[PDB]
Ligand binder design. Sequence first.
Ligand SMILES: N[C@@H](Cc1ccc(O)c([N+](=O)[O-])c1)C(=O)O
Ligand SMILES: N[C@@H](Cc1ccc(O)c([N+](=O)[O-])c1)C(=O)O
Ligand SMILES: N[C@@H](Cc1ccc(O)c([N+](=O)[O-])c1)C(=O)O
Ligand SMILES: N[C@@H](Cc1ccc(O)c([N+](=O)[O-])c1)C(=O)O
Ligand code: NA
Ligand code: NA
Lengths: 311, 311
Amino acid sequence: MDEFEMIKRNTSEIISEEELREVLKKDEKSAHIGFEPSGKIHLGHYLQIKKMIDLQNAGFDIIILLADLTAYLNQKGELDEIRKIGDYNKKVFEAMGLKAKYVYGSEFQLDKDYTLNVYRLALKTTLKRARRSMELIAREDENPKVAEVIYPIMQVNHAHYRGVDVAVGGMEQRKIHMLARELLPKKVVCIHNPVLTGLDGEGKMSSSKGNFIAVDDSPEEIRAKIKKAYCPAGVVEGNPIMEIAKYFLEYPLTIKRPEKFGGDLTVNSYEELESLFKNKELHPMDLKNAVAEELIKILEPIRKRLLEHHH
Amino acid sequence: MDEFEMIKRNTSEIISEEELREVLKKDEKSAHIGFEPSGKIHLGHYLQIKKMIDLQNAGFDIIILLADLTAYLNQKGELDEIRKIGDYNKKVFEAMGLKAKYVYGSEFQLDKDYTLNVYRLALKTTLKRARRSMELIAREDENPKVAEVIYPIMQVNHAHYRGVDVAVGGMEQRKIHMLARELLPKKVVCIHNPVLTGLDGEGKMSSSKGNFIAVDDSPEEIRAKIKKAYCPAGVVEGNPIMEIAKYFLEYPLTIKRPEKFGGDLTVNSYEELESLFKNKELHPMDLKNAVAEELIKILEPIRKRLLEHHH
Ligand SMILES: N[C@@H](Cc1ccc(O)c([N+](=O)[O-])c1)C(=O)O
Ligand SMILES: N[C@@H](Cc1ccc(O)c([N+](=O)[O-])c1)C(=O)O
Ligand SMILES: N[C@@H](Cc1ccc(O)c([N+](=O)[O-])c1)C(=O)O
Ligand SMILES: N[C@@H](Cc1ccc(O)c([N+](=O)[O-])c1)C(=O)O
Ligand code: NA
Ligand code: NA
């Protein structure tokens, strides 16, 4: 497993693998990701931070944007409060083990030169394209605002401003990134991570949809959340519990079961787990129980680092 | 005729007359108008400059924005060239007799605080409202750009930034001004001047439609343009020649005619002219001839001031 395969692990798409290969030959390389500050940091965040750590171990210089200004544009409240959530988010990301350069968008995104560039990009971006690129990002609004279409070109310009080699995001970011790749002189390699299904199975996992597991949830909270989750037997597609097994659990893995249900079961790989589960050889409740306990152990260091701040 | 009536002369609407009355009681009062730089200055410009001179004589401090940045947003070309046209436009406005403070939008519209305000207004302005407000302003584009909707909120913020008492524009500006009146804490009095019909009668007079009389056109040019113009007998509505008689000619006025067509005719007022013309007592060609000669004499000082620069 070389650096390229490590980086590709568990991604949905890399635009493009040949360009990424060229980047990996450089000694000095940069990757960045931006996060609108969020009041709870959940497994979707952690999946992305995990990817930044992968890149960091591949020799990348890592930048994390606390995207306070685009969060303001996306109707998340005042800037001062957004900034305070940003500082909390940074502490969580540090607790996750990421030492990086943390920057607030408003530190530079209001400079004359940045703004002039944003306006130059606004001349090249159609309203229709801008709106399409925000479909999975914009706060729901029956009356969309001008701010919605300024949002994507801020994110495009950021990649230009920083000269970063690689941009990372969830798949929800992919249309903004392909806009960047179309408009900017330097083409950024984009790495997109899968969108986690929320615990209800109804939509995507989000801080605003109340369908997430937070990295600092208590053990009892996690058990309850998993126990209630959508997880139909034989079904992997849109199964949030199977997703968690695929992206966060360490293998080989021992699923503990009562002997009257077959007793303990050791899987050496997610793919092994997947066949057992598709073949209805693994009951949803036994999967839930194992996922819950292993995730508790996975998140424990993060929760304890954050709880030590209170102590 | 007091200051209020002088200011109201030949306007299409004042939003609102009661607010304007309150402004006129102040000793220190400000009015502004903005112009995207234009390669030819025409009678539509002159009508608006005439209104600024009216205000100036009413004791208003006058500001003229050479709107280089919004012109850039509206797809009029580079900024450096736009700025050069702006400087030419200023010289024409001076030749028209307006001594004022001339400012370029880019001198201040890119400052951090200005931009932050623009983004705050973008949170309160719907895309639909922004687009509607640009219907008569935006360059024709089958694929409208994000820049189109940033444009109006720049103009709104400008009024906020300057704290001006009065904003002046053609009626094409009225939806942007009513947006300003809705969003800003200080309500600006808006004075709207009529939109001149182009010489073809087909649409509005514009620098880009080639249907205008420029203030520096030669006498022979003006005669030709007027001679070719739409001017149907008995019709005042959308008659560009009658419009010119109403907004630019001095009364009383002598229309010279051959005796075989009734001989010279003296009208003491546009309204007099209008009845003679509606009653088909005035032939279009005699109207054209008089309009042409009087307009030539009206524009002569402007043309000579500008021609003295070459000399
Ligand atoms: N769109 C990201 C936030 C973001 C990512 C990258 C960026 O460069 C910027 N930005 O420039 O403000 C913002 C989100 O959904 O959380
Ligand atoms: N179309 C997406 C947009 C969206 C998704 C998730 C979110 O958390 C937010 N949000 O915070 O505003 C917005 C949706 O399902 O709503
Ligand atoms: N919309 C005006 C130009 C303009 C008027 C007033 C203004 O404040 C600004 N502006 O702020 O850039 C621009 C035109 O059609 O020519
Ligand atoms: N809808 C208007 C917009 C417009 C009018 C006049 C103009 O000069 C320009 N322009 O310069 O782009 C634009 C039109 O008839 O085209
Ligand atoms: Na080296
Ligand atoms: Na006084």
